Short mmCIF file of all heavy atoms in Angstrom, two decimals:
data_model
loop_
_atom_site.label_atom_id
_atom_site.label_comp_id
_atom_site.label_asym_id
_atom_site.label_seq_id
_atom_site.Cartn_x
_atom_site.Cartn_y
_atom_site.Cartn_z
N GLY K 1 24.08 197.72 100.79
CA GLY K 1 25.13 197.71 99.68
C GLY K 1 26.06 198.82 99.84
O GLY K 1 27.39 198.54 99.98
N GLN K 2 25.64 200.05 100.02
CA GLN K 2 26.49 201.26 100.28
C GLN K 2 27.38 200.97 101.53
O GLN K 2 28.59 201.20 101.53
CB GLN K 2 25.74 202.46 100.46
CG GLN K 2 24.85 202.79 99.19
CD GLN K 2 25.75 203.61 98.11
OE1 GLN K 2 25.45 203.52 96.93
NE2 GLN K 2 26.73 204.33 98.63
N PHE K 3 26.71 200.52 102.54
CA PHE K 3 27.39 200.26 103.92
C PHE K 3 28.45 199.25 103.72
O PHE K 3 29.57 199.37 104.28
CB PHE K 3 26.37 199.77 104.89
CG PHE K 3 26.93 199.95 106.25
CD1 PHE K 3 26.88 201.06 107.00
CD2 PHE K 3 27.41 198.76 107.06
CE1 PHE K 3 27.22 201.10 108.23
CE2 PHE K 3 27.79 198.77 108.20
CZ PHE K 3 27.78 200.04 108.97
N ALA K 4 28.32 198.14 103.06
CA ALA K 4 29.27 197.08 102.81
C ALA K 4 30.37 197.67 102.15
O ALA K 4 31.59 197.29 102.34
CB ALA K 4 28.62 195.82 102.14
N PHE K 5 30.11 198.43 101.12
CA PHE K 5 31.20 199.12 100.31
C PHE K 5 32.00 200.07 100.90
O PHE K 5 33.26 200.05 100.87
CB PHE K 5 30.57 199.74 99.00
CG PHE K 5 31.62 200.19 98.05
CD1 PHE K 5 32.22 199.42 97.07
CD2 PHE K 5 32.00 201.54 98.18
CE1 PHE K 5 33.24 199.95 96.14
CE2 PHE K 5 33.06 202.00 97.28
CZ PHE K 5 33.61 201.27 96.34
N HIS K 6 31.55 201.12 101.72
CA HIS K 6 32.16 202.18 102.38
C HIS K 6 32.61 201.81 103.78
O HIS K 6 33.63 202.36 104.21
CB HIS K 6 31.31 203.35 102.36
CG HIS K 6 31.19 203.98 101.00
ND1 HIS K 6 32.24 204.57 100.28
CD2 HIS K 6 29.99 204.07 100.21
CE1 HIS K 6 31.87 205.00 99.12
NE2 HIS K 6 30.57 204.83 99.05
N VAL K 7 31.93 201.04 104.55
CA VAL K 7 32.13 200.74 105.98
C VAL K 7 32.75 199.30 106.05
O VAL K 7 33.81 199.15 106.81
CB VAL K 7 31.01 200.90 106.84
CG1 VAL K 7 31.29 200.60 108.34
CG2 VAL K 7 30.41 202.31 106.63
N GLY K 8 32.20 198.41 105.29
CA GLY K 8 32.91 197.05 105.36
C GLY K 8 32.81 196.45 106.76
O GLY K 8 33.79 195.62 107.13
N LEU K 9 31.76 196.56 107.47
CA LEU K 9 31.70 195.93 108.94
C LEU K 9 30.29 195.25 109.08
O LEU K 9 29.41 195.79 108.59
CB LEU K 9 32.00 197.02 109.96
CG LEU K 9 33.38 197.62 110.11
CD1 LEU K 9 33.33 198.63 111.16
CD2 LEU K 9 34.27 196.38 110.53
N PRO K 10 30.34 194.26 109.87
CA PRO K 10 28.95 193.66 110.04
C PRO K 10 28.09 194.52 110.97
O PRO K 10 28.61 194.80 112.10
CB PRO K 10 29.25 192.26 110.74
CG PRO K 10 30.66 191.88 110.13
CD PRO K 10 31.41 193.39 110.22
N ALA K 11 27.04 194.81 110.53
CA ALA K 11 26.08 195.82 111.39
C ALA K 11 24.68 195.50 111.12
O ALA K 11 24.23 194.95 110.15
CB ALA K 11 26.49 197.14 110.98
N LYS K 12 23.79 195.98 112.10
CA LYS K 12 22.34 195.81 112.02
C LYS K 12 21.70 196.95 112.57
O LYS K 12 21.94 197.42 113.81
CB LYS K 12 21.94 194.60 112.73
CG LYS K 12 20.42 194.28 112.56
CD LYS K 12 20.13 193.84 111.06
CE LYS K 12 18.66 193.89 110.79
NZ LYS K 12 18.36 195.30 110.42
N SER K 13 20.83 197.68 111.93
CA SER K 13 20.10 198.87 112.50
C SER K 13 18.67 198.35 112.89
O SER K 13 18.13 197.37 112.66
CB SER K 13 20.18 199.92 111.36
OG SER K 13 19.50 199.46 110.16
N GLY K 14 18.01 199.43 113.62
CA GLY K 14 16.68 199.21 114.21
C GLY K 14 16.08 200.66 114.11
O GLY K 14 16.66 201.74 114.21
N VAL K 15 14.76 200.66 113.95
CA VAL K 15 13.78 201.89 113.77
C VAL K 15 13.95 202.73 115.00
O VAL K 15 13.59 203.84 115.00
CB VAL K 15 12.43 201.45 113.47
CG1 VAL K 15 11.70 200.91 114.62
CG2 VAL K 15 11.80 202.52 112.89
N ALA K 16 14.41 202.12 116.10
CA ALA K 16 14.58 203.00 117.33
C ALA K 16 15.86 203.86 117.20
O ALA K 16 15.99 204.67 118.07
CB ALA K 16 14.72 201.89 118.48
N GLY K 17 16.65 203.62 116.25
CA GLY K 17 17.78 204.52 116.09
C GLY K 17 19.09 203.86 116.55
O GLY K 17 20.18 204.39 116.46
N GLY K 18 19.04 202.51 116.76
CA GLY K 18 20.27 201.85 117.15
C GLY K 18 20.91 201.28 115.96
O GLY K 18 20.39 200.74 115.02
N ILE K 19 22.33 200.97 116.19
CA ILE K 19 23.16 200.34 115.25
C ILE K 19 24.06 199.43 115.94
O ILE K 19 25.09 199.87 116.49
CB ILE K 19 23.87 201.35 114.26
CG1 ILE K 19 23.01 202.11 113.59
CG2 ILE K 19 24.86 200.54 113.38
CD1 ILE K 19 23.78 203.20 112.57
N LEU K 20 23.84 198.11 115.87
CA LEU K 20 24.71 197.07 116.46
C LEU K 20 25.94 196.93 115.46
O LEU K 20 25.71 196.42 114.36
CB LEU K 20 23.94 195.77 116.60
CG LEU K 20 24.49 194.74 117.56
CD1 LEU K 20 24.35 195.11 119.02
CD2 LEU K 20 23.66 193.44 117.20
N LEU K 21 27.14 197.43 115.88
CA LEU K 21 28.24 197.26 114.96
C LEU K 21 29.31 196.27 115.56
O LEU K 21 29.46 196.09 116.83
CB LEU K 21 29.01 198.68 114.91
CG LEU K 21 30.05 198.77 113.93
CD1 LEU K 21 29.74 198.72 112.55
CD2 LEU K 21 30.78 200.24 114.21
N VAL K 22 30.00 195.57 114.65
CA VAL K 22 30.87 194.49 115.10
C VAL K 22 32.18 194.70 114.23
O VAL K 22 32.10 194.74 112.97
CB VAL K 22 30.30 193.17 114.92
CG1 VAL K 22 31.33 192.14 115.29
CG2 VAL K 22 29.02 193.00 115.73
N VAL K 23 33.33 194.67 114.97
CA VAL K 23 34.77 194.65 114.37
C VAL K 23 35.25 193.29 114.93
O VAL K 23 35.82 193.24 116.02
CB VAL K 23 35.56 195.86 114.87
CG1 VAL K 23 36.90 195.92 114.04
CG2 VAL K 23 34.80 197.18 114.73
N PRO K 24 35.23 192.35 113.99
CA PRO K 24 35.70 190.97 114.18
C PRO K 24 37.08 190.96 115.00
O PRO K 24 38.04 191.70 114.48
CB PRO K 24 35.73 190.36 112.94
CG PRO K 24 34.57 191.01 112.15
CD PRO K 24 34.82 192.52 112.54
N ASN K 25 37.19 190.17 116.10
CA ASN K 25 38.36 190.03 116.75
C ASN K 25 38.82 191.28 117.48
O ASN K 25 40.08 191.39 117.98
CB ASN K 25 39.44 189.45 115.95
CG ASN K 25 38.92 188.17 115.26
OD1 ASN K 25 38.44 187.17 115.86
ND2 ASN K 25 38.98 188.18 113.93
N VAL K 26 38.14 192.39 117.49
CA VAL K 26 38.53 193.62 118.05
C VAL K 26 37.61 194.19 119.13
O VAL K 26 37.91 194.44 120.32
CB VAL K 26 38.80 194.68 116.99
CG1 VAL K 26 39.26 195.93 117.59
CG2 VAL K 26 39.70 194.12 115.92
N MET K 27 36.33 194.48 118.73
CA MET K 27 35.43 194.87 119.68
C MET K 27 33.85 194.88 119.13
O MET K 27 33.54 194.69 117.90
CB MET K 27 35.68 196.35 119.89
CG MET K 27 35.65 197.35 118.67
SD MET K 27 36.11 199.06 119.04
CE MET K 27 35.01 199.81 117.89
N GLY K 28 32.93 195.26 120.04
CA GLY K 28 31.53 195.30 119.69
C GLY K 28 31.06 196.60 120.00
O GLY K 28 31.73 197.33 120.93
N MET K 29 30.08 197.27 119.36
CA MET K 29 29.63 198.65 119.55
C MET K 29 28.19 198.74 119.42
O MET K 29 27.62 197.82 118.80
CB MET K 29 30.44 199.53 118.65
CG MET K 29 31.78 200.04 119.02
SD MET K 29 32.22 201.41 118.01
CE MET K 29 30.58 202.24 117.78
N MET K 30 27.74 199.79 120.04
CA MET K 30 26.25 200.02 119.82
C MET K 30 26.13 201.53 119.74
O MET K 30 26.35 202.33 120.80
CB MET K 30 25.54 199.45 120.97
CG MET K 30 23.96 199.88 121.02
SD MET K 30 23.03 199.52 119.49
CE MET K 30 22.04 198.10 119.85
N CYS K 31 25.64 202.03 118.66
CA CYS K 31 25.51 203.40 118.32
C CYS K 31 23.90 203.65 118.45
O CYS K 31 23.21 202.81 117.95
CB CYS K 31 25.93 203.94 117.11
SG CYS K 31 27.74 203.77 116.78
N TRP K 32 23.47 204.82 119.08
CA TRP K 32 22.05 205.04 119.19
C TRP K 32 21.73 206.49 119.14
O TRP K 32 22.35 207.29 119.79
CB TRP K 32 21.59 204.37 120.48
CG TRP K 32 20.11 204.76 120.64
CD1 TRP K 32 18.99 204.38 120.05
CD2 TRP K 32 19.64 205.55 121.88
NE1 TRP K 32 17.91 204.75 120.52
CE2 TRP K 32 18.12 205.47 121.70
CE3 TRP K 32 20.13 206.16 122.90
CZ2 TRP K 32 17.36 206.19 122.53
CZ3 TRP K 32 19.33 206.84 123.89
CH2 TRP K 32 17.90 206.77 123.65
N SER K 33 20.74 206.81 118.16
CA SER K 33 20.28 208.15 118.00
C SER K 33 19.02 208.04 117.24
O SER K 33 19.07 207.69 116.01
CB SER K 33 21.37 208.94 117.30
OG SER K 33 20.72 210.27 117.37
N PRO K 34 17.80 208.20 117.83
CA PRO K 34 16.47 208.23 117.29
C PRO K 34 16.16 208.75 115.89
O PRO K 34 15.47 208.11 115.09
CB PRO K 34 15.54 208.92 118.38
CG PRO K 34 16.26 208.55 119.54
CD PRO K 34 17.80 208.63 119.26
N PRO K 35 16.85 209.80 115.61
CA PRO K 35 16.51 210.30 114.09
C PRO K 35 17.14 209.51 112.97
O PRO K 35 18.39 209.18 112.87
CB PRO K 35 17.21 211.71 114.09
CG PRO K 35 17.28 212.06 115.67
CD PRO K 35 17.66 210.74 116.27
N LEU K 36 16.22 208.99 112.15
CA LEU K 36 16.59 208.03 111.06
C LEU K 36 16.68 208.78 109.76
O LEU K 36 16.04 209.81 109.60
CB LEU K 36 15.62 206.91 111.00
CG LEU K 36 15.18 206.13 112.28
CD1 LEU K 36 13.96 205.29 112.05
CD2 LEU K 36 16.47 205.55 112.91
N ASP K 37 17.21 208.19 108.67
CA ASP K 37 17.20 208.87 107.32
C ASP K 37 16.28 208.23 106.54
O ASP K 37 15.50 207.23 106.99
CB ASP K 37 18.60 208.73 106.77
CG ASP K 37 19.14 207.28 106.57
OD1 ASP K 37 18.27 206.38 106.63
OD2 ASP K 37 20.40 207.14 106.37
N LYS K 38 16.15 208.53 105.16
CA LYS K 38 15.15 207.83 104.28
C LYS K 38 15.21 206.33 104.27
O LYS K 38 14.26 205.63 104.18
CB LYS K 38 15.43 208.36 102.85
CG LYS K 38 14.96 209.89 102.63
CD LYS K 38 15.39 210.78 103.76
CE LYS K 38 15.16 212.23 103.17
NZ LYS K 38 16.18 212.72 102.25
N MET K 39 16.53 205.82 104.41
CA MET K 39 16.78 204.32 104.47
C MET K 39 16.23 203.72 105.67
O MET K 39 16.06 202.57 105.72
CB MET K 39 18.21 204.02 104.29
CG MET K 39 18.98 204.78 103.23
SD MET K 39 18.88 204.02 101.56
CE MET K 39 17.25 204.67 101.07
N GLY K 40 16.11 204.51 106.74
CA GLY K 40 15.69 203.95 108.01
C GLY K 40 16.79 203.78 108.99
O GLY K 40 16.56 203.19 110.10
N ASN K 41 17.92 204.16 108.81
CA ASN K 41 19.23 204.11 109.67
C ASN K 41 19.38 205.36 110.45
O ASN K 41 18.94 206.52 110.01
CB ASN K 41 20.47 203.73 108.87
CG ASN K 41 20.08 202.46 107.98
OD1 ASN K 41 19.65 201.42 108.48
ND2 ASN K 41 20.59 202.69 106.76
#
């Protein structure tokens, strides 16, 4: 919810610390960093 409101981009996280990010018709991205927060991101 928070993510859709403040970032507004299609994304998917994983417990390994990755975040598959997508900016429609512009680019694809992959951020990665093992330390997660309470939410698991």
Side-chain angles (χ1 to χ4, degrees):
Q2 298 279 152
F3 196 81
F5 182 89
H6 293 288
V7 181
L9 289 176
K12 186 74 196 80
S13 59
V15 75
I19 296 185
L20 192 71
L21 185 69
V22 179
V23 184
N25 310 301
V26 183
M27 59 179 219
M29 277 189 39
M30 174 52 106
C31 300
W32 175 63
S33 187
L36 317 170
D37 61 19
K38 284 47 169 288
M39 312 275 88
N41 306 313

